């Protein structure tokens, strides 16, 4: 699909409130295209038509829009246009989408500002009631290690930072299975210890605000010694049962840039769909997701994971902006996959067919991830914009 | 929002603004304020751009300090200004200078001076800490931009510090359209930086 909207026959500008159609074609007018288009606010539709393309081979076409609703309240208004050709030819069906693409329109960012959760602590742990809510932090490890809705338990494993992709094909850079490339990222990365790297405590106190709990923890991981990543994170649940997780993380500029900057952890919770906001219906990466939209998408659990025959890490969804499964929600920018394949059994799987559905469902929320190359994959082709190198990275999620 | 709060070795502040103009709100931000124990101030900023604006020319704070000195001293990027979209020529070091040379006297006065990448800054007893641009000066943004010749410059009360998270590129391809890459404008929505003054 990357493909088709990279090749697609029809190019778009946008200037305010008219659309420019280009044709690519060379010999035929667009004499089976239909073109719609749609405003949406954060996956809400408000407005859209239907205007007859009419434009020669390599002409151009105006179209204006007409007065756009102009919402109250507040989010990011998006333009989505798509080509549709009403009637079958001898290679398509009737509806077939040649083209498409989306564009942000005006943004309303929000200023509308929105009992006390108790903090029991321990000496093993930190735990946070609020209602039948709570959470509790393991004061060894420092990681959030079970949370409970009534008497239900939903983490199986606990919610620790993760830096490593199960390697892709592209990442692991072998054309003739008798050479190995040193240069390549899966022999750098696994050189460097990141498949290895243990996290040392630095830092796990809590605090009680005015109106919420406070948990502060600091991680350094580490192989032989040298410091690869550290990872400080502040625990903030409020009174409205929300978790805001802020995680600022450094990276040691001699090692080579991690795969990915997130979170990871098994959800107790299997269940059918998955609904988000952000990013395209199919798999998206930060190298590759133009053919992909911003809407409110809503697909079964099965179609978060692309079955590649050799697997890999997969089912990246970028852009997203909040995602919903089961009882819980995640909020904020970050990039996600969710599936019954841990990474680890990814990575120590050489066929699709081996693989087994564990226990839960894992979840890898990603602030950053690296781009997956592609130019060849023989060598490292991933671009030097694509590479998670800015040694410094921040970001912030809020679950419930 | 404004609120003040006691933890177990220090107060935090937390407080939001939104920048509005004609009832648009072009930039929030949210600001911690954390003040330990040992007499350091921990700030943590983040800004969010509405993205139909025009991207902002710089994500910073500035203030007028009180104290004149003599000497610069910092730890970052070149002894010479530079700026995101040219900073080549320069390279960290721990420089020292004295105050007249971290202003550039252009005829047509503009924001100038900046010094980009900069870990450590020092100016009498202040010391800033983090990952930033800065300028430092006795001229206020707001009298650059309304001075059109230098010679009329008159030095400010105290000293103008503008400590940037975030800078724009200058351009320079060409003077009389818009000239900066799209890799050097603040086009991320969503930004974030942390400086500790002690």
Redesign the interface.
């Known amino acids: 699909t990357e493909a088709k909207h990279q090749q697609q026959f029809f190019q778009f500008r946008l200037s305010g409130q008219t659309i420019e159609v280009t044709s690519e074609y060379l010999f035929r007018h667009s004499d089976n295209e239909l073109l719609h288009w749609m405003v949406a606010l954060d996956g809400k539709p408000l407005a859209s038509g239907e205007v007859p393309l009419d434009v020669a081979p390599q002409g151009k076409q105006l179209i204006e829009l007409p007065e756009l609703p102009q919402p109250e309240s507040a989010g990011?208004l998006w333009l989505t246009v798509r080509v549709v050709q009403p009637n079958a030819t001898a290679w398509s069906e009737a509806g077939h989408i040649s083209a498409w693409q989306q564009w942000?329109?005006?943004?309303?960012?929000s200023?509308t500002?929105p009992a006390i959760p108790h903090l029991t602590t321990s000496e093993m742990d930190f735990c946070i009631e609020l209602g039948n809510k709570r959470w509790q932090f393991n004061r060894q490890s420092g990681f959030l290690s079970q949370m409970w809705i009534g008497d239900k338990k939903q983490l199986l494993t606990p919610l620790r930072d993760q830096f490593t992709r199960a390697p892709l094909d592209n990442d692991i850079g072998v054309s003739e299975a008798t050479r190995i490339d040193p240069n390549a990222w899966v022999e750098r990365w696994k050189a460097a210890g990141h498949y290895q790297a243990e996290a040392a405590l630095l830092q796990c106190?809590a605090?009680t605000?005015?109106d919420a709990v406070?948990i502060t923890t600091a991680h350094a991981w580490q192989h032989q010694g040298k410091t690869l990543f550290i990872s400080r994170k502040t625990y903030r649940i409020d009174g409205s049962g929300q978790m805001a997780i802020t995680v600022?993380v450094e990276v040691a500029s001699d090692t080579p840039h991690p795969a990915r900057i997130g979170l990871n952890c098994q959800l107790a919770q299997v269940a059918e769909r998955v609904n988000w906001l952000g990013l395209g219906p199919q798999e998206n990466y930060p190298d590759r997701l133009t053919a992909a939209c911003f809407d409110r998408w809503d697909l079964p659990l099965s179609d978060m994971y692309t079955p590649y025959v050799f697997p890999s890490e997969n089912g990246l969804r970028c852009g997203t902006r909040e995602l919903n499964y089961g009882p819980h929600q995640w909020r904020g920018?970050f990039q996600f996959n969710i599936s019954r394949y841990s990474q680890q059994q990814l990575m120590e799987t050489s066929h699709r067919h081996l693989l087994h559905a564990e226990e839960g469902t894992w979840l890898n929320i990603d602030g950053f991830h690296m781009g997956i190359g592609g130019d060849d994959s023989w060598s490292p082709s991933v671009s030097a914009?694509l590479q998670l190198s800015a040694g410094?990275y921040?970001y912030?999620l809020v679950w419930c």
């Open positions: 990011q942000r329109l005006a943004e309303n960012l200023v500002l106190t605090d605000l005015a406070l600022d920018d914009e410094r921040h912030q």
